[PDB]
Amino acid sequence: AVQKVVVHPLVLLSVVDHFNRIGKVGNQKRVVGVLLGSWQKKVLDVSNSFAVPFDEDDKDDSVWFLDHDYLENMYGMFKKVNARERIVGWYHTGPKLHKNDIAINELMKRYCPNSVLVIIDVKPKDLGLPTEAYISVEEVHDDGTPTSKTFEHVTSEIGAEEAEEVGVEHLLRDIKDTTVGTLSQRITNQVHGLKGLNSKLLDIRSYLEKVATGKLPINHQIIYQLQDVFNLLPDVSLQEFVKAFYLKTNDQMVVVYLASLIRSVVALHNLINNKIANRDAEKKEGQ
Amino acid sequence: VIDAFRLINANMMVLGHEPRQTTSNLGHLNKPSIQALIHGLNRHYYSITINYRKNELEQKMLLNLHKKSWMEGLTLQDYSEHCKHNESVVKEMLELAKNYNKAVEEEDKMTPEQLAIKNVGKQDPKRHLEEHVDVLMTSNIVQCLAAMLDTVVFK
Amino acid sequence: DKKFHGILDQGEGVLIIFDEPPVDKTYEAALETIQNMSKVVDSLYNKAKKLT
């Protein structure tokens, strides 16, 4: 199992590039490639990738051709180029998982005993990362239903080598805004977090709408998880949590006040120095 | 740092020719570096200007780099660690306040070397005090706002 | 002598014992910093009004 996975800007760029290549060549709506990386302790760093010729139908959910001969040729060649980048999984640029994903994961597992799929949604997004990482795992159902292979999510994030960071920063030299300030950036992070929480709640609400109306069968694991969450929701009017909140709010506002006073004194010192310099310069000019 | 090149012909450079045609004013790349000039630029090879392609789509993922999940956006720092950090930082602020009182005293007193050679090798109470107030105020304001937003949204 | 935090109720004849909270060091440091920055502001008087 892999709890954490780090994808790289080179991987993202190559995935976008492969999607564009296939779009220009024909019309598939999805592209699949192989993903090479390292195995830092319980952390999968996927450093590179290469496209492989993949095709599938839209109806049977079983008619799909993946060229593992091309896969192994390209992998051995990339091994000749660089050795540390071993097969670590595969990627497919679908907006969402597919039925074939389990079979393709088995085909990859024929190569990597612990293969991690990463859906790299090439379509631009706003409230989430572009990579969704999954790992196949057997689901031993408690209700006696037969055990079946299923995809399990693993926390995925984007990280860069030193050179990758240098390159991406050069590319974003004029777009990325760095004159924001730490406080402004953190407030932006807070509002983005609120937006993400709202998006997750809206997804759950839509699923509940579908289930209640009847499109989706009752999923007992999901219902268990939902009621566990709703029970985990805290109470902020207990008359003891309120006292603790006020006590810590004051314990923080005292420090904020001290810092503000110190900043005010420093600003007054700067003003005194500036006015002293101004008078000295003016008097010397008048001399 | 990257540069494109193609080689000048020995034949032409001996038979008096410039192996580049100056139709445009695009020969102002960077005032080529002395390293390249001494290593053989403008004699055996020439530099070709380099630009880049902007798609506004790859740039979206390059921006998605450094991005933090809403978990991190809404997480509150460990309150015990936060209190310990505030205590410590206020302690260094106290010491720097003593040193700032000392420095402001013997600042206008004499300024022959105060300009540049009175802080080298010695701590600057004003600068470090500014740094401490900035960092602690950022932390405290951010955690207060996070706590309040959490108290409401997770009700 | 502060060898334990408690109060002796004579009437009933009992001994109440308090888990006295520790003294906050942040406020101690804040007050001392306020004093030192008051010294700084006095020095700022001295610089400014004499020069300004």
Place this chain on the structure above:
Amino acid sequence: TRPANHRQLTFEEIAKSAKITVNEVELLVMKALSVGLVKGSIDEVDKRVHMTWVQPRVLDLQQIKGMKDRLEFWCTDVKSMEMLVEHQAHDILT
């Protein structure tokens, strides 16, 4: 069945519900906690069983709908503060 706020159970209530006595409800509650079906604590001085979590239970369609309404309320609150923060910090907010 009890809500998430007034989920304090008295020995008398549990005894009436389970046809046991207040002297055995205490052992019953400790057995429940040990087997892990519920989480909480017991205050026998006031004979109140504070509870904070129960084993997830199957829900009917009406219960799913009620949970959906609760989720809608939560989503409205989240959206309200998203809007408030954005509007109040619009200047600095990037």
Place this chain on the structure above:
Amino acid sequence: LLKLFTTMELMRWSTLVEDYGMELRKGSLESPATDVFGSTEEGEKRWKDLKNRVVEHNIRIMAKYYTRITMKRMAQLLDLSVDESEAFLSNLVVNKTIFAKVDRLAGIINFQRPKDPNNLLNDWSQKLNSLMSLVNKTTHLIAKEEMIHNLQ
């Protein structure tokens, strides 16, 4: 017996002795009974130590399950009188094995340490973090079920 001592639940020493005592301290001619509790000075000491271990187990269970308790009940559940029970609890507290404040006037014992604002807000923030993680997990389950039941 090992199961009883490794179970996270109370156990009365009276029933412990009744069910097991006759076949640990004596008896079991078919399967010789060990000498760990034989009728000799050291065996008596070991039996008293077993009683102490039983009381310690009961006190630990009550400490972890109870927010508050009265001595008249703690002694009853420990099969000791109020004086011996409170002396044992005082010994444990002094040794710092178990924390418990004993309000003798009201005849109460509470095993909960005084509420700290830091601890309270830390518990609240941990609840919030677990809630965010659980909503992420549940939405991943939503995605999985939608994948399985949406295309066909």
